[PDB]
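User: quick one
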Amino acid sequence: ALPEEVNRTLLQIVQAFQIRSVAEKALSEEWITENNIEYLLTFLAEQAAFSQDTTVAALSAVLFRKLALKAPITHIRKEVLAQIRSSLLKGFLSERADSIRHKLSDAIAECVQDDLPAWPELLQALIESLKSGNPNFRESSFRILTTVPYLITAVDINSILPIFQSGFTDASDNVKIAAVTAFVGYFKQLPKSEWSKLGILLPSLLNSLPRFLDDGKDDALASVFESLIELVELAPKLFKDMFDQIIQFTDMVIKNKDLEPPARTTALELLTVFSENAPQMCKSNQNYGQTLVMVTLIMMTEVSIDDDDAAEWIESDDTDDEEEVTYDHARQALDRVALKLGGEYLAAPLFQYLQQMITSTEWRERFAAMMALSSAAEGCADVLIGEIPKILDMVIPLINDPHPRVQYGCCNVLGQISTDFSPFIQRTAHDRILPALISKLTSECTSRVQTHAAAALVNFSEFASKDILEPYLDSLLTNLLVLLQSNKLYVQEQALTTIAFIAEAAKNKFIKYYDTLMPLLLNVLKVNSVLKGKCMECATLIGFAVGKEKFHEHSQELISILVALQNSDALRSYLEQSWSRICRILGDDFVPLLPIVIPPLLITAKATQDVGLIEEEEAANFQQYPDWDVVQVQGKHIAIHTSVLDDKVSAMELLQSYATLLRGQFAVYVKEVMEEIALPSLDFYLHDGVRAAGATLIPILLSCLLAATNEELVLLWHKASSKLIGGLMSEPMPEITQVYHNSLVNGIKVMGDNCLSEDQLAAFTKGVSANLTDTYERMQDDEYNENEEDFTDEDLLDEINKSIAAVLKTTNGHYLKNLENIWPMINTFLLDNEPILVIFALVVIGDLIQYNAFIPKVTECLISPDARIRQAASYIIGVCAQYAADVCIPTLDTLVQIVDSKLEENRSSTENASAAIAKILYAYNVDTYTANWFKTLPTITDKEAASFNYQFLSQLIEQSNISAVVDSVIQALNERSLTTVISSVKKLLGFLPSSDAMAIFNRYPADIMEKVHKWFA
Amino acid sequence: GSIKK
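Assistant: Done. Structure below.
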């Protein structure tokens, strides 16, 4: 179909793939033009179809696929696309190698698009290929259906259903995998309105599963499981009436431990994932939780195979054995499910098993019981927090088990639950936990057990008071000093860390032990980077615990050693946090150490986005590394160095903390950090952590400059605010949008009055609109899915209200004009059924009056079942009578009723309504209305509301209510809601003889009476 | 040097 000329030229080029680079240039610069692209695509499609050289055909098919997107295939003439399609199809039906038909299939897929004229030759080609006796023909057909799922819509329903049913049952496992892949792929690509069309085939798929176990093909079973895992995340309700069959089948696979791990782990994952996508379905079925618990407990047993003495486990690291895969999966599975379903559902089936396993003569079951409880403790905390002497009655007796890994196992529970059940367990079970853990620190126990007990002491210490730790400290430290003398490095390192965080909790109670520990620490440093890092961490944490004055006995020597260590990646982080910790200790005396500490932080915080314009094949190949991630922006892939950008964030966080502590002392760096680090970080579109860290950096930097000193502060703020504003109408992540608004408020708070210009205020209104528009759109968005986590929208709308309030305040009103442009959207929120948008709109209006067609909804919102809506509404009515009558006085008995309430959840609402009474009662000044308002006192939660109730109370002054008058003030002060009504009260007590005056305070205890006298005359 | 899942 091409001139013989063009063929030899292009054949040479494709074959050449000095000689090669000349071909790559020739292709990309000469043969991808408006004048040559059609000839090239025609050529490559012919080579892929007809060439009998393996490499030429393969590359051409690959090249054709890539360049088909870029052209795009749409702008290709009719006569040539027809020839290209027909040649691709002819090559498909010919005899090609498996890999080439795969690449032909991928090439064919690029020629199917709603843009293009219909291609019914392909549909009929696929239908017959699916019946072919060659598995590769059947497999490749499903592959095309996977890449182009809309072809499934094109085939008649009575043809496509038998096709998949034949696919699920096919004698070839490659075909079955491809059939399942295509089936699931249909659901992840098409709208839900198309789902009830292949959905009826799920029973056929599930019924095909037992075949994999009969043929002994568990490897193919794992692949199908993974496809099923994806379907559960898309349409869990589809599994509802065959739920028990899924459960029993996964149970059967997992119990069969003659199978390999992949079939067993994927089966577990399938079971697990139901709890994350259909929690109500799991809870309405007792068989799920029982099976899940039973199956994970079996897998946790699989440890130390062919090693009953655990003589290999005793002799190794305190790191995890990477070979105990099924054990690891079982732990995470139980944890994940418990977190989703809660304690009240699966605490009982869990403990029904734990009671049994605790008494076994097989130590692996005794060990597993401890690990299971450790994994399930957090998710089941709502129940297990109450059964907290019960658990220790099982766990603590196992601490002295003959087998060391059961001992280790027992330490792990006490550690895990010290975190999950904090801070209540520290206050309640310190008498049982600490002696248990201490008894295992002794050197007669094996190294692994000492270390894990010491590790558990870190968990306990984190939320333990210094008063509780105090009588245990000496015994704790004498034991840990022994661990410090171990010949095993990981025992030494754990000893240092345990001591450090025991000291952190002990605080000033640790000054007792400074003189004996610090020289031992210095000795270690003077002579294993992990050791020295943990040692310096221990030294500085002790320093912050005992205080600056005590720390100064070794601080300079400690600092000199730090310098040697720094200029000599775990170590780098230990050194950074040590420097930062010393700054918290020394205060302003850290300033001379800034030239040492800051410059390396500056370098790391200036890292750019290490981007790699990447290509299809050599991706995923980069995904192996945890320090690399790849995403798609608009079609073309990219590869980004995530770790480098994570390090950037960590450095920015340290710079921010130094700036926060030092304040004015840090002003010298403000201009550099703002222009080279903070603001450029906002343009980091492939890492939202950097964007967030850059935003929070801004107000604190300006805060540093203001305290020290200005056109620079104004120029930097104008630059910072403008880029913050500009981010609002562009930022895709709603989470980041919240940070910018929050950053603006904090910035406005710092800069003060008149800090914004007319342009800025207008561009801010644009951003507010786009933020409100996209939030409304997302919130206005089941047969397949069960009915939150979306406080992201609420938190976003939260901060927006504070920015508007802040902007209104700094403009001193003149933002009223700009704010009218977005009232149409504001109005919709107020009159939308949905609570979050209602609350937002109400709060905005309240801030408006602060400086006709909304009163209808507000009065309706006054009696709302939601307290949040009543609070916002009451404030609006109250604020109306404040500095803006035909509505206030009529609603005045509505708010009487709303007041009558004093419950923690609704205490805030009834206190605003209360205050709303007091200023209707102030501007209009009824004496029975005031008597009603008086029994709403005192106001203890809302600060601004209480601030006024007592202001009014002092106006009504400057009978038998005198002790109700006083106590109303006492409770306000003591609850820290109000802060001189005191002056008024003292006068009321003055008009009484002293004996009657003093007896009012004859009901208050010493605590409050101490405050009362430092309050009154 | 702590205990975690």
